[PDB]
Amino acid sequence: MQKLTVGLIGNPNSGKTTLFNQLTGARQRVGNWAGVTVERKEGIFATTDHQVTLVDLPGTYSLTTISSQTSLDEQIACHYILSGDADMLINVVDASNLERNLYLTLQLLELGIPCVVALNMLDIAEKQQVRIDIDALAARLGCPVIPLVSTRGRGIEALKIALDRHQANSDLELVHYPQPLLREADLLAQQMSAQIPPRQRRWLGLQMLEGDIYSRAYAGDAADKLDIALANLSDEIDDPALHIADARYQTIAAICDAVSN
């Protein structure tokens, strides 16, 4: 029995609290994110091989801020995910709004954090005549995808086995970004703290290029973005932030269509 730290993440209203309580029962403590007002719930449970600490993370639709005035809430889950204190994540997805929920899902697989998706609200999706091919969705995301109805407590056991068994998401060419954006995101990548693993480094350069406000603080060379963007003014010219998003959205668009009836 190894101790294992899992983060619980999701868009707001994906049924994350329900799930938190199904997993931890009465064994949960209420605290706050360090130096701040936002509440940090955390609790515990045991699968066949791990004694897990589950750390609830604030709802967010996206990790990336292109923006100024988002929130403190939405801005903290990035920070935690990137710190490494979590060994794997549970991604709570509202099956009834897949395409919209998968933006966040897809940023996490791009970060590379081991990840199991809790496809929650399978009953709401049926009531809307939405059928989803789970096996197919897992084959496209590269990570387990486990069916849930948190209200009833359906799937909690399979969600746990999944966590016992999953180690590493499948290594996938998920989003096709245009080459110049990549070339700069690696330029930006390769001049950053070596503790930060290579995928995450890359991901952050993409984020920097895209406009992310609070990403500049992990880089150690944002002294250096202004020139990345200029070297691009020729190439995938007008708008890096457009083509960056577009590529993720087409990815998620294609997935959703492969797999929803």
Ligand X SMILES: Nc1nc2c(ncn2[C@@H]2O[C@H](COP(=O)(O)OP(=O)(O)O)[C@@H](O)[C@H]2O)c(=O)[nH]1
Annotated binding-site residue numbers for Mg(2+): 17, 21, 24-25, 133
d(CA 132, CA 158) in angstroms, rounded, equals 18
Which of positions 134-153 make contact with ligand X (CB under 6 A)? 148-151
Which CB sits closer to ligand X, 27 or 176? 27
25 binds ligand X (CB under 6 A): no
- For residues 155 and 118, is the Cβ–Cβ distance under 8 A? yes
CB of 232 to ligand X, least distance (A): 37
Pair of tokens at residue 151: 């209200």
Strand pairing class (2-10; 88-94): parallel
Minimum distance, C-beta of residue 124 to ligand X, in the bound complex (Å) = 5
Q: Which is nearer to ligand X, 97 or 191 (CB)?
A: 97
Question: Is residue 120 near ligand X by the rule CB under 6 A?
Answer: yes
| Cβ 246 to ligand X shortest distance, Å | 28
- 243: tokens are 């083509």
The token pair at 47 is: 């699968």
For ligand X, the closer of residues 81 and 188 by Cβ is 81
- How remote is the C-alpha of 52 from its chain's centroid? 19
Residues in contact with ligand X, counted by CB under 6 A, come to a total of 17
Q: Cβ distance 141 to 117 under 8 Å?
A: yes
Q: 34: which 2 tokens?
A: 């360090």
Minimal CB distance residue for ligand X: 15
Under the criterion CB under 6 A, does residue 59 sit at the interface with ligand X? Answer: yes
Site residues for ligand X, window 176-195 (CB under 6 A)? none
CB of 14 to ligand X, least distance (A): 5
| From 9, 106, 116, 121, residue interacting with ligand X (rule: CB under 6 A) | 121
Stretch that binds ligand X, among 65-73, 75-83, 120-128, 172-180 (CB under 6 A): 120-128
Binding flag, residue 71, ligand X (CB under 6 A): no
Question: What are the binding residues?
Answer: 10-18, 21, 24-25, 35-39, 56-59, 120-123, 133, 149-151
Q: Which is nearer to ligand X, 123 or 224 (CB)?
A: 123
Nearer to ligand X, 63 or 209 (CB): 63
Q: Using the rule CB under 6 A, which residue among 16, 140, 160, 202 binds ligand X?
A: 16
Q: Determine if 220 is a binding residue for ligand X (CB under 6 A).
A: no
Write out the residues near ligand X by the rule CB under 6 A. Answer: 10, 12-18, 59, 120-121, 123-124, 148-151
